[PDB]
Design a protein that fits this description.
The PDB classes it as immune system. Keywords: immune system, in silico antibody maturation. The assembly is dimeric. The structure holds two protein chains of two kinds. Chain A folds into two domains: 1-112, Immunoglobulins (Immunoglobulin-like, Sandwich), CATH 2.60.40.10; 113-206, Immunoglobulin-like (Sandwich), CATH 2.60.40. Chain A is built from no helices and 21 strands. By secondary structure, chain A is mainly beta. Chain A has strands spanning 2-6, 10-11, 17-24, 33-39, 46-52, 57-59, 67-68, 71-72, 77-82, 91-98, 101-102, 106-110, 119-123, 129-139, 145-148, 157-159, 163-164, 170-179, 189-194, 199-204, 209-210. Helix content of chain A is 0%, strand content 50%. By secondary structure, chain B is mostly beta strands. Chain B has two domains: 1-109, Immunoglobulin-like, CATH 2.60.40; 110-217, Immunoglobulins (Immunoglobulin-like, Sandwich), CATH 2.60.40. Helix content of chain B is 4%, strand content 47%. Chain B contains two helices and 18 strands. Chain B starts with 7 loop residues before the first strand and ends with a strand. The chains are: A mainly beta, B mainly beta. β21 (209-210) of chain A pairs antiparallel with β18 (215-216) of chain B, so a sheet runs across the interface.
Chain lengths: 211, 217
């Protein structure tokens, strides 16, 4: 059983948020209930609503007039419609259901700012452990994902929380420590993905010529 | 968030912690309590249901109980990797789900001094008109750390930002990244760029620095 959210990373204020949850490995009409729960950044969980076996819906009373939850039996998905959104609706949205199974969650940002793809700069190693990394700068909105060597390199990796610059754009760094002896033989590539702007970059990080 | 949890709890490896969850008679008072573990970047995972029942896959290090309008999560034999946000949940009087604000668990490992690295801006970025200088503080404990930037011995105040990782799943340490941002023109007006680090595990402050023009490519 797999649940997978899909939807925009960015929504303008007063518009309608629209999300879908693809259910794999299970029939949606065989489910006890299907629902949505959200989590504002750095905060706790808040239940939005659920649709049950009969199709009967129950919504969070503070959100009721803005929420619609329905089911697509042919696509084997259910959805969430949240109208008239404001910055207060910025959160990670999870779909869930009882066969409970949770999805990965998808971050939705409500902002009047626009989508912007990142630039990727190397944090190149130089003068028995060396540190290196990638600076993922000036993007909007969150999130970005970073891996190293297409997943093959995980030990010693630290991908930091993004910081909101005063420009209104996010910046993030991802580093890794490796043996110094490997700098001349091992290739290190950071894999950067910014789905809101549909931007993917594979950046090779090479030792600096320092003197 | 409806239920009340403490912001954080902490103890050493192998020890036990308990996490409290306070509600009222209309929720926890009348209804079952469940618990979740949320590791950074992941969805909450069910640890306890029906007050004290463990789902398949959850070790008996985790336990739950309920007394009146409060519930309690117990975690014995604390391990690195147990660091997470923990949530209690129940149903209100309308039988709708409600949740606590969460509790972050910290593992109290031994003091570890940070390894410090500094990165000059890339020529590539310099062509884009800006210079980001990055200082890395790697695998230290505890969290408290002080990073001070100096440019030609001038203390930098207000033009840097930092962020910290969560405790590492393998050694329970933190890491910190600090970025000093200058315009290209400003960057080319100075020589010495230095990051000075203060931490409990260091007998005296450590400084890593470079001179503009030492590195290429």
């Amino acid at each position: 059983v797999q649940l997978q959210e899909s939807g925009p990373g960015l929504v303008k204020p007063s518009e309608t948020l629209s999300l879908t949850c693809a259910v794999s490995g299970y029939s949606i009409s065989s489910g006890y209930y299907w629902g949505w729960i959200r989590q504002p950044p750095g905060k706790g969980l808040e239940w939005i609503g659920s649709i049950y076996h009969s199709g009967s819906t129950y919504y969070n009373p503070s959100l009721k007039s803005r929420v619609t939850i329905s089911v697509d039996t042919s696509k084997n998905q259910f959805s969430l419609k949240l109208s008239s959104v404001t910055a207060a609706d910025t959160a990670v949205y999870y779909c869930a259901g009882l066969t409970a199974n949770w999805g990965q969650g998808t971050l939705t940002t409500v902002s009047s700012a626009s989508t912007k793809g990142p630039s990727v700069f190397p944090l190149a190693p130089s003068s028995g452990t060396a540190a290196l990394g990638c600076l993922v700068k000036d993007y909007f909105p969150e999130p970005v994902t970073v891996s190293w060597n297409s997943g093959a390199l995980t030990s010693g990796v630290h991908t930091f929380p993004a910081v909101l610059q005063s420009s209104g754009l996010y910046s993030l760094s991802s580093v890794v420590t490796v043996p110094s002896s490997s700098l001349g033989t091992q290739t290190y590539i950071c894999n950067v993905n910014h789905k809101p702007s549909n931007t993917k970059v594979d950046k090779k990080v090479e030792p600096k010529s320092c003197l | 968030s409806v239920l009340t949890q403490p912001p954080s709890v902490s103890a050493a490896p192998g020890q036990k912690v308990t996490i409290s969850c306070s509600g009222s008679s209309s929720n926890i008072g009348n209804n079952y309590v469940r618990w979740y573990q949320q590791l950074p970047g992941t969805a909450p995972k069910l640890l306890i249901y029906d007050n004290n029942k463990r789902p398949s896959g959850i070790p008996d290090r985790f336990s739950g109980s309920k007394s009146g309008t409060s519930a309690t999560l117990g975690i014995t034999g604390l391990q690195t990797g147990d660091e997470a946000d923990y949530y209690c949940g129940t149903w209100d009087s309308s039988l709708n789900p409600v949740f606590g604000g969460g509790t972050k668990l910290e593992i109290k490992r031994t003091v570890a001094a940070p390894s410090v690295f500094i990165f000059p801006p890339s020529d590539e970025q310099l062509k884009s008109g800006t210079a980001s200088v990055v200082c890395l503080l790697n695998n230290f404990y505890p969290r408290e750390a002080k990073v001070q930037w100096k440019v030609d011995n001038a203390l930098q105040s207000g033009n840097s930002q930092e962020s910290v990782t969560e405790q590492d799943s393998k050694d329970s340490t933190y890491s910190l990244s600090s970025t000093l941002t200058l315009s290209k023109a400003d960057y080319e007006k100075h020589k010495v760029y230095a990051c000075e680090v203060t931490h409990q595990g260091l007998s005296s402050p450590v400084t890593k620095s470079f001179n503009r023009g030492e590195c290429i490519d």
